[PDB]
Amino acid sequence: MDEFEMIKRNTSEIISEEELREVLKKDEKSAQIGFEPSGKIHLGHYLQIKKMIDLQNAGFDIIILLADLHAYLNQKGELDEIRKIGDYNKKVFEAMGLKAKYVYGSTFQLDKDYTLNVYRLALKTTLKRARRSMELIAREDENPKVAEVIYPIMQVNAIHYPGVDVAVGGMEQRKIHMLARELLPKKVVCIHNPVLTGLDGEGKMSSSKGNFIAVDDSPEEIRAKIKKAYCPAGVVEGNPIMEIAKYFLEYPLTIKRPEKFGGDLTVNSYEELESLFKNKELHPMDLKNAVAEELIKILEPIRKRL
Amino acid sequence: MDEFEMIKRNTSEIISEEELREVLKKDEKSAQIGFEPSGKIHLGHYLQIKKMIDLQNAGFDIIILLADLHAYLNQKGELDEIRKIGDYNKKVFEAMGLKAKYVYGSTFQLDKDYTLNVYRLALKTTLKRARRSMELIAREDENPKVAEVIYPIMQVNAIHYPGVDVAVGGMEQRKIHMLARELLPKKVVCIHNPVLTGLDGEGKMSSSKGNFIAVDDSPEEIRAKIKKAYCPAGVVEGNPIMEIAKYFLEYPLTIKRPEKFGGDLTVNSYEELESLFKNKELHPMDLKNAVAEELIKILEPIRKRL
Numbered sequence: 001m002d003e004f005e006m007i008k009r010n011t012s013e014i015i016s017e018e019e020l021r022e023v024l025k026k027d028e029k030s031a032q033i034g035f036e037p038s039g040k041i042h043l044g045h046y047l048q049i050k051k052m053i054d055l056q057n058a059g060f061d062i063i064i065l066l067a068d069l070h071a072y073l074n075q076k077g078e079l080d081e082i083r084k085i086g087d088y089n090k091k092v093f094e095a096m097g098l099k100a101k102y103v104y105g106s107t108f109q110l111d112k113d114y115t116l117n118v119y120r121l122a123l124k125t126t127l128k129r130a131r132r133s134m135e136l137i138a139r140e141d142e143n144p145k146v147a148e149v150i151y152p153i154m155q156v157n158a159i160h161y162p163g164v165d166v167a168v169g170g171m172e173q174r175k176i177h178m179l180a181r182e183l184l185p186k187k188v189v190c191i192h193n194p195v196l197t198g199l200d201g202e203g204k205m206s207s208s209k210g211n212f213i214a215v216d217d218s219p220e221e222i223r224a225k226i227k228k229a230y231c232p233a234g235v236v237e238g239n240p241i242m243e244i245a246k247y248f249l250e251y252p253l254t255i256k257r258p259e260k261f262g263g264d265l266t267v268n269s270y271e272e273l274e275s276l277f278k279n280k281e282l283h284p285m286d287l288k289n290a291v292a293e294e295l296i297k298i299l300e301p302i303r304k305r306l
Numbered sequence: 307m308d309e310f311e312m313i314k315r316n317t318s319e320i321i322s323e324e325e326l327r328e329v330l331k332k333d334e335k336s337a338q339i340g341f342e343p344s345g346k347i348h349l350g351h352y353l354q355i356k357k358m359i360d361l362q363n364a365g366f367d368i369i370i371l372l373a374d375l376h377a378y379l380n381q382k383g384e385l386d387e388i389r390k391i392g393d394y395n396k397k398v399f400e401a402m403g404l405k406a407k408y409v410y411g412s413t414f415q416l417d418k419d420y421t422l423n424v425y426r427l428a429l430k431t432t433l434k435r436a437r438r439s440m441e442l443i444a445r446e447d448e449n450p451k452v453a454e455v456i457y458p459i460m461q462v463n464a465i466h467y468p469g470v471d472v473a474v475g476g477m478e479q480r481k482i483h484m485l486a487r488e489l490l491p492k493k494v495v496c497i498h499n500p501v502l503t504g505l506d507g508e509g510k511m512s513s514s515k516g517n518f519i520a521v522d523d524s525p526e527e528i529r530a531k532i533k534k535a536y537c538p539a540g541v542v543e544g545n546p547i548m549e550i551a552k553y554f555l556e557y558p559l560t561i562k563r564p565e566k567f568g569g570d571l572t573v574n575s576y577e578e579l580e581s582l583f584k585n586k587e588l589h590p591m592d593l594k595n596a597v598a599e600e601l602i603k604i605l606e607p608i609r610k611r612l
C-alpha cells in the first residue's frame with residue numbers, strides 16, 4: 001500500500017523523495033523512461049517496465065520513449081526497420097501490462113526547435129561534466145568522438161521536451177539525469193532502478209551479450225541458463241540468481257529438498273532467503289532449482305499472450 | 307593574366323593549388339566564405355571580400371554565408387534583429403563591388419537533414435581533432451563546453467551543404483578546413499587568407515573591441531586612427547600599417563616627404579617600401595601619412611556609395 005512506497009520499492013534512489021511526495025499530490029502527472037529498441041526483451045527491461053507500471057497505477061501518465069534515432073546514426077537498421085523492432089517491444093510491454101504512450105525520438109529529436117535547444121544546452125555543458133556522464137554508460141572509445149559528448153545533452157533535452165515530472169532509468173543514467181536537474185528550468189524527479197547483473201556475473205544483462213533471460217524464453221531456456229549462471233556459496237553480492245529473487249519472485253517462497261540433504265522450507269521474505277544463503281544452509285543448486293521453477297511461473301503470463 | 311596567379315595573390319596558402327587549377331578549368335565553379343553579421347565592417351572583411359571578388363572574376367559564383375545562428379546562440383541578437391545587421395553588411399559588401407549570393411545559416415543549419423549529418427559527422431570527429439580546430443580561432447575556454455567541439459563540425463557541414471568547389475577564409479580556419487577535407491566525400495580547395503593585424507599590434511583588427519579602420523570611416527577618423535597605430539621603425543613583422551601597405555595600396559605610390567627629411571620617394575614595389583622602412587630610411591611618420599591618405603582615396607568610393 002501507499003503509492004509512495006509502491007514506487008519506492010526496489011528502487012536504487014529517488015532524486016528528492018520530497019519532490020516526489022509533491023508530484024504525487026498533483027491530479028495530472030507524467031513520467032518518462034527511454035528504451036532503445038532491443039532484439040530481445042530481458043528481465044532487465046522487465047525490471048524497469050515493472051517500475052513504470054508502478055507509476056502507472058498511481059495517476060502518472062507513462063511515456064515510453066523509443067531510441068530509434070541512436071540506432072539510425074550508430075549504424076544499424078533504417079528507421080522503418082527499427083520501427084519494426086520497436087513495435088515488437090510495444091507488444092511485449094503491453095504483455096507486461098504497461099498502458100503507456102510510445103514515441104520514437106526520430107520524430108522530434110531532429111526537428112528545428114529541438115536541435116536549437118540542444119545546441120543552446122551545449123553552451124552551458126562542460127566537456128567534463130558531459131564526458132563523466134557517458135562514463136557510467138560505456139568504457140570510452142580509444143580516441144573519443146564529439147558525438148559522445150552530444151549524447152547526454154540529447155537525452156537531456158528529451159526530458160525537457162515532454163515536460164514530464166518524472167524520469168525513470170537505471171543507475172547508469174544518474175549523471176545525465178543529474179545534468180538535467182541542473183540544466184533544465186524545470187527540475188525533474190528521477191527514479192533510478194538498480195542495474196541487473198548478467199548471468200555469468202559480469203556486467204548488466206545486456207542482450208548485446210548472451211547472459212540474459214528473455215521474458216519470452218521457454219521453460220527450458222530458463223532452466224538451462226540458470227543452471228549455468230554464476231552463483232557462489234554464501235556470497236550474495238553480485239549473485240545474479242539472488243537478484244532475480246529480490247526483484248521478481250513472490251513470497252512466501254517454499255523451497256524443496258530431500259530431508260536427507262536439507263529439508264523443505266518456507267522463506268516468508270527475501271531477507272530471510274538472503275540470510276540463509278549467507279549462513280550457507282541454502283546450497284547454490286537448491287536456490288537455482290527454486291528460482292528457476294518460480295521465475296518460470298512468473299514470466300509465464302507474458303510468454304503466453306505472445 | 308593567369309587567373310590562378312591573380313587569385314594566388316595575397317593568399318597565405320591554397321590547400322592544393324593543383325586542385326585549384328583543375329577547378330579553374332570547369333565552367334561551373336562556386337565558392338563561399340562565411341561572415342558573422344558585424345556592426346562595423348573594417349578592412350579585416352575588406353582583405354577577403356576582395357579575394358572573393360577575384361574568384362568571381364575567374365568565374366566562381368560567389369556565396370556569402372551570414373552565420374546569423376551562431377550570432378543568435380551567443381546571446382547577441384534575436385534572429386530578425388541580427389538579420390537587419392547582416393543585411394547592412396550585405397550592402398557594404400555590395401558597396402565593395404561584389405556580385406554574389408547571400409544566405410543566412412538560420413535558414414538551413416537547423417533542418418532535419420542538415421542536423422542529421424552534423425551528428426553522423428559527430429561520430430567521425432575525435433574530441434581533440436575538434437578542439438585543436440577552434441584553438442586557432444578564439445583561444446580556449448577555462449571550462450570548455452560541448453558547443454566548442456560542435457562548432458567545427460557545424461562549419462564542416464556548412465561547406466558540404468551548398469557543394470562549393472572552394473572554401474575561402476582566414477588562416478585561423480585552416481584546421482577547421484582540413485577536417486572538412488578529411489571528412490567529406492570531396493576535398494574542397496581552401497584558399498586561406500592572411501590575418502590582418504589590429505592598429506595596436508595586439509591581434510586581428512577586431513570590430514569586436516577596438517583597433518580597426520571601418521570602411522565608412524571619415525578621412526579625418528582614418529587619419530586619427532592610422533596615426534595612433536603601432537608602427538615601430540625598422541620593424542616590419544607585426545606592423546599593421548605595413549600590412550595595410552602590402553594588402554591595399556596600389557604601387558607605385560609616391561610617399562610625400564619633407565625635403566629636409568630625405569625628400570619625396572617613389573616606390574614601385576611593396577618590397578622597396580619594406581626595404582626602406584626596414585633600413586630606417588622611411589621613418590614611421592612619413593609611412594603612416596602616405597598610407598592614411600592612400601586609404602582615404604580607396605575607401606571613399608565605398609564610403610560615399612553608402
Ligand SMILES: [K+]
Pocket residue numbers: 002004005
Ligand atoms: K509512508
